[PDB]
Amino acid sequence: MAGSHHHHHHGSMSEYIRVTEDENDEPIEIPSEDDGTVLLSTVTAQFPGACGLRYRNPVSQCMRGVRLVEGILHAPDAGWGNLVYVVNYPKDNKRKMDETDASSAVKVKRAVQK
């Protein structure tokens, strides 16, 4: 319902992700990352609120599932493909309200024990 943004291009791309939420709906094509994964920002573009995506292959008849780490939807060892996907969420979550720039990097001593 809320959230869309408009900033997730970066360099390279490799390929894209083509998946649809509804079986009757058409497979929407969205831009992915160079590594192959997909930025969460994109997932919200068409699937707002969606927390996780499932894998639905009519020809594969398997039980695969799109991996999600740090918001970035990782792709399988086969790729996104042009199959269907099943959303996984109650309605919304957000759990995000902080956007600032700062650096606090620092070295650490050797921590050894038994």
17-26 burial by CB neighbour count: b if 16+ within 10 A, else e?
bbbbbeeeee
Tokens of 47: 């699937």
3-state secondary structure of 79: coil
Q: Look-up: residue for tokens 């759990």?
A: 95
The domain locations on the chain are: 1-114
Instruction: Write down the experimental method used for this entry.
Output: NMR
Identify whether the C-beta of residue 83 lies closer than 8 Å to the C-beta of residue 21: no
Whole-angstrom Cα distance, residue 49 to residue 82?
A: 22
Whole-angstrom Cα distance, residue 51 to residue 91?
A: 9
Backbone phi and psi for residue 9, each to the nearest 5 degrees, phi listed first: -110, -65
Whole-angstrom Cα distance, residue 114 to residue 79?
A: 44
Q: Comparing C-alpha atoms, which of 66, 85, 70, 69 is closest to residue 25?
A: 85
